[PDB]
Design a protein around this ligand. Structure first.
Ligand SMILES: N=C(N)NCCC[C@H](NC(=O)c1cccc(O)c1O)C(=O)N[C@@H](CO)C(=O)O
Ligand SMILES: N=C(N)NCCC[C@H](NC(=O)c1cccc(O)c1O)C(=O)N[C@@H](CO)C(=O)O
Ligand SMILES: N=C(N)NCCC[C@H](NC(=O)c1cccc(O)c1O)C(=O)N[C@@H](CO)C(=O)O
Ligand SMILES: N=C(N)NCCC[C@H](NC(=O)c1cccc(O)c1O)C(=O)N[C@@H](CO)C(=O)O
Ligand SMILES: N=C(N)NCCC[C@H](NC(=O)c1cccc(O)c1O)C(=O)N[C@@H](CO)C(=O)O
Ligand SMILES: N=C(N)NCCC[C@H](NC(=O)c1cccc(O)c1O)C(=O)N[C@@H](CO)C(=O)O
Ligand SMILES: [Fe+3]
Ligand SMILES: [Fe+3]
Lengths: 346, 346, 346
């Protein structure tokens, strides 16, 4: 028996071969456990990975065309999941997130699955990454019978994060830069999405930054108005995005199929927006892009390192997140690293 | 045949295997006797431990999931206890508290149990901790056939308290700091709950402090108005709480699943309240948090030591309650110590 | 899963909670991994730490009185270990030394444990400190699930040794001082115990000294006669001891409860002995004391540094092994550094 991220006790199956993914991008945690057979045990998933991660999807499709045949239990919202299609896949485990584009701990689907005798496991990389990322992997390890892969990934993660925290944990508040992170910058109806005490806010905290929205918001995610950002005028501006290169919608292009040029050009569009473009951080060139999906992925150690290099460039001169990324892929994954997951403004 | 804390003679069962807990948090006294098999002999308990100690509960659940199946004889009040459900558990002993969220010496349930041939034992950690804590453990030892564990715990307790009283018993009244303790600070409808001649007041007395409410109240618990506190303007302010980290209700977060940062941030909210924030003690930083449930637990030596170290920081520089706790857990308990049971203001 | 110091493969246990120490002073390696909970996972140990390290023992007892209740599997010799008492502690791992006052790789007890399904790990700080100290810590890290602590300690050790080797690695052999180390000087029946190509000899080598016994002895430990020492007449004389202050037996007083004046007075007795007192090194004041138990401890970087400062006083005038010890204690241990681990003759 194990305790999940919702505090609930789950009886670990003896053998698992039919994993249901409540949120598609929970695949990222699964991918670190499944080695060269990533999709072998996935009976179905939320459509967020396929529809909101088109780049990483296409790369896996070229090497594994059977990914197109994994059933989509819904689109990009918990309310679009048919509980009927879910139950006919006869899952032997369901992995859900405390928050996100999939069902939460109190949804009806979770209760249906409990009535059907299906174990449900709650993880979290999104609400409280700092508290939950490593415990989530430990748990996934136990319930999916990949304790070795999980323990290997925890050691890798802790080591690569400790490279940052051993420095930034001793830095006093008055030496820290103020930071604003604009999630899916340019791409929301109303500006500006950001993170509070949670989500990418945890990364700012760890990397020794001072999140200007920490005390503006009650939750992990929320909204702050453009004028409030301008008025606080923070040291460092960061925009998140995951837009595909050939997508004429607004936002920052980052991901497996994005070149540095495309990333630099599309970040610049984001930085050229009225108001944003007068920020001290933008004018001083302390303006950056981070790949959005790190907001819900145990690969988030890559962002924590990118933030640290941006927050204290010389103290982390020697640290290279591309090498962390390469090590991650070679040790754990079944595809080759490509594209641009972070960018600095020209 | 032995004398309980209500002065009543009780017959020690030849063998006990079905313990009824009048107040759930009386478990704390039982836990010191049951070693690695904490829940083996509990037939049922008041729901206060499960509902008002969610953190310590969850930790025991992760290691012992059978705790969820122990029957709840009521919620959090003596009046919600069904005497019928109690009697069908066929207890062979019932442990009750002279005061608290469970039946007292004159309740009907106590009389019913006497008619049913069931021995009832009264303990006390709440009304008169100083008089009653050690005698209570001695008695529980005898009636539960754990005399060794009890005598071991008494020696540990006396030794760890003597570390304080050796010093504070010789301090004259006029050199003692004035102290106000605000129980469940921030979390009551009407401010401010506190302790008089009894409860945490006994801890203030032992730790060489001067409880400003000692003479304002007739009983162990009561209420003093905010303005009375402001006017007395005591040297030292202490707030008690046991709020879970992820609980948006008002109060201080302390317990097994609370990090120091969380305790400090939530203590600060408590200290930022109108009136409280102008106290000399708050401005001077002599402001502290203590875990509420020490108000009814033989682990109360941890608070006594935390009080003495706040009352005389250099005389108790060398005393460390986190070790006293770690020694307590390793010697007596079946879980690992985690979280924050005491905090100092930043 | 891992290769120990005897070349044997040991399967890393999933969880360890019952560590058996073949030699008590192997605790020193464990202490670097267990943080503030040093004795939490020790089921039992050889009595050498308690009986041959009375000072370090007493310091840990004053903070942790539960250390007295850890079972002693024997006295100070492998032949006094009851294999029966060992097996009834149901260890889940046993840590043994290639050499010392506990069982070796060919003992019966090692075979018994293999029959019982208990993993055995061989470490070494004693025979071949230079080859084995860091590999031993790496291994202990993996099998005890304290990889972080281990990697932290290795980095600390390598850095603090590099402070010496950066200088002594470029000194040519003909400029190096001849050195004799007399182990447990004054305290043996027959003079003079010393180290050959191993044990404290490795420290002499690293610190840029020339061990006069290197080629007189086949093993790590052995004996050279007084007259051979007198005839070689080495540049530098070093005596090891660990005698308690209030012990009027012969030997050097060094350890956690020893003052510099007691270490100087007792070293002087050792240097006033017939034969020894005519050494050029003694007359010239190049005579020193080192704490014996460094002969089997990963804290041995303190002796390497103390030796280099004795071998090349001005080249290492800026090096302070006391600051190193303090960085060691504060970073890794649960007690406060006290006493005298090294002394110079007046
Ligand atoms: N397409 C929708 N209508 N909703 C998306 C579902 C989840 C929702 N997401 C966000 O608020 C969000 C904010 C910034 C950046 C992102 O990538 C986001 O997905 C959400 O978070 N809902 C909360 C509240 O219900 C939750 O799930 O607890
Ligand atoms: N809670 C909401 N109603 N909207 C915020 C989230 C929903 C939607 N999200 C995305 O399009 C998205 C894309 C990639 C990765 C993600 O995690 C995403 O959430 C969204 O942003 N809607 C915008 C309008 O498009 C909005 O609602 O402001
Ligand atoms: N929800 C209720 N009505 N009562 C709760 C339990 C009984 C009551 N408790 C307290 O007054 C109390 C006060 C401060 C802090 C605490 O943690 C408390 O539990 C109570 O004690 N009643 C008294 C008077 O009869 C008693 O039982 O002796
Ligand atoms: N005698 C009373 N009427 N109130 C005092 C106790 C009743 C209640 N207590 C708790 O919720 C509680 C929680 C954790 C631990 C405890 O020991 C508790 O007693 C209480 O405080 N009610 C509040 C309103 O919430 C109040 O009295 O204002
Ligand atoms: N107490 C005993 N009678 N024997 C102890 C056995 C270990 C023995 N140790 C030493 O010879 C020694 C020499 C100098 C200084 C020390 O602190 C020592 O402990 C020993 O090493 N024996 C050999 C051969 O059996 C070995 O263990 O390899
Ligand atoms: N192999 C042997 N027979 N003797 C050498 C070691 C045995 C004994 N050891 C100790 O007293 C001792 C004390 C502290 C730390 C250690 O590592 C120790 O070994 C010893 O030295 N006996 C002497 C008699 O005085 C001797 O053999 O000369
Ligand atoms: Fe999203
Ligand atoms: Fe209460």
């Amino acid at each position: 028996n194990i305790t999940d991220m919702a505090g609930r006790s789950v009886v670990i199956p003896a053998k698992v071969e039919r994993i249901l993914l409540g949120e598609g991008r929970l695949f990222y945690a699964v991918s670190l456990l499944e080695g060269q057979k990533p999709f072998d045990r996935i009976v179905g998933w939320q459509g967020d990975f396929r529809k909101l991660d088109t780049q990483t999807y296409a790369v896996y499709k070229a090497k594994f065309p059977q990914v197109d045949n994994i059933p989509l239990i819904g689109n990009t919202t918990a309310d679009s999941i048919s509980p009927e299609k879910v139950l006919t896949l006869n899952p032997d485990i369901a992995i859900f997130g405390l928050s996100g584009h999939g069902p939460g701990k109190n949804s009806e689907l979770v209760k249906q699955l409990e009535k059907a005798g299906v174990p449900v496991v709650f993880v979290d990389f999104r609400t409280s990454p700092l508290k939950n990322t490593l415990p989530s992997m430990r748990v996934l390890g136990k319930v999916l019978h990949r304790e070795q892969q999980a323990n290997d990934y925890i050691k890798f993660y802790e080591d690569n994060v400790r490279k940052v925290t051993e420095i930034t944990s001793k830095i006093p508040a008055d030496k820290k830069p103020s930071v604003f992170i604009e999630l899916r910058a340019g791409a929301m109806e109303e500006c500006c999405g950001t993170a509070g005490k949670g989500n990418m806010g945890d990364f700012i905290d760890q990397a020794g930054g001072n999140n200007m929205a920490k005390n503006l918001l009650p939750g992990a995610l929320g909204t702050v108005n453009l004028e409030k950002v301008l008025s606080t005028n923070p040291d460092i501006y960061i925009a998140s995005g995951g837009k595909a290169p050939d997508n004429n919608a607004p936002g920052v292009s980052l991901g497996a199929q994005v070149t540095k040029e495309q990333a630099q050009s599309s970040l610049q569009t984001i930085l050229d927006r009225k108001g944003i473009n007068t920020l001290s951080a933008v004018k001083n060139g302390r303006s950056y892009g981070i790949w959005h999906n790190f907001y819900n992925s145990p690969y988030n150690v890559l962002a924590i390192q990118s933030f640290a290099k941006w927050f204290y460039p010389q103290q982390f001169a020697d640290l290279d997140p591309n090498n962390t990324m390469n090590s991650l892929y070679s040790q754990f994954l079944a595809i080759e690293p490509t594209g641009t997951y972070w960018v600095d403004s020209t």
